[PDB]
Amino acid sequence: GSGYGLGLSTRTQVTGYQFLARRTAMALTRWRVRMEIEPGRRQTLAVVASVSAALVICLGALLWSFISPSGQLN
Amino acid sequence: GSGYGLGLSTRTQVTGYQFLARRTAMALTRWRVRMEIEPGRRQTLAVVASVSAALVICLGALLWSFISPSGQLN
Amino acid sequence: GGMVAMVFASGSHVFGGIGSIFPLFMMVGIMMMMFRGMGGGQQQMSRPKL
């Protein structure tokens, strides 16, 4: 009983837990839970987009390395 | 009070306000709210169409600049 | 992006500087159609009818 150990888990349960967490994070800072709008996710996605944009530029430079080879000490 | 300050807002609230703005604007010029047809929209859209045509023409001009430049002498 | 990369690797260098406005506006135009656009059949509500 009590769910001890590392048992397998259903995908339906994964979003369930992640939902209760977001709701709980809001209570600590906004002290309310009506959540007409959910800024937590909106604010999080913007960071993911920035990191993603940075990786794209690195691929560009890596691609440039194959178009016109040259070198520097490393 | 209620409604004061910079609180959050939703997409349904944005159209709701723009509807009230259009409805009140004609009430100042036509003294009736029937709004059988909405000429303000059309008059406004007409300007946007005008602006779009100007941008299209100058991009067309920029397209002309690369196809037959000034430096092709002799 | 591949066409631009293909042209830059070919050495035409025509898209350098101000010439870049063509790929740029096209890329933005595609973005408007894919992220916004309009709702489907189960979204019968819309600004003209609401």
B-chain residue closest to C47, CA distance: B15
Q: % helix / strand / coil in chain B, to the nearest 5?
A: 65, 0, 35
Documented resolution in Å = 6.7
SS3 B26: helix
Q: Which method, experimentally, gave rise to this model?
A: cryo-EM
Say whether C19 and B66 touch across the interface (CB within 8 A). yes
The residues on B that touch A, with CB distances below 8 Å, are: 8, 10
> In residues, how long is chain B?
74
SS3 B68: coil
**Residues from chain B contacting residue A36 (CB–CB below 8 Å):** 8, 10
E strand or H helix that includes residue B14: helix B11-29
Residue carrying structure tokens 């602006």: B51
Mutation for testing the C interface, residue in B62, B63, B64, B67 having most C CBs under 10 Å: B62
Q: Does C36 touch chain B (CB under 8 A)?
A: no
* Angle of CA points A34, C42, A49, to nearest 5°: 60
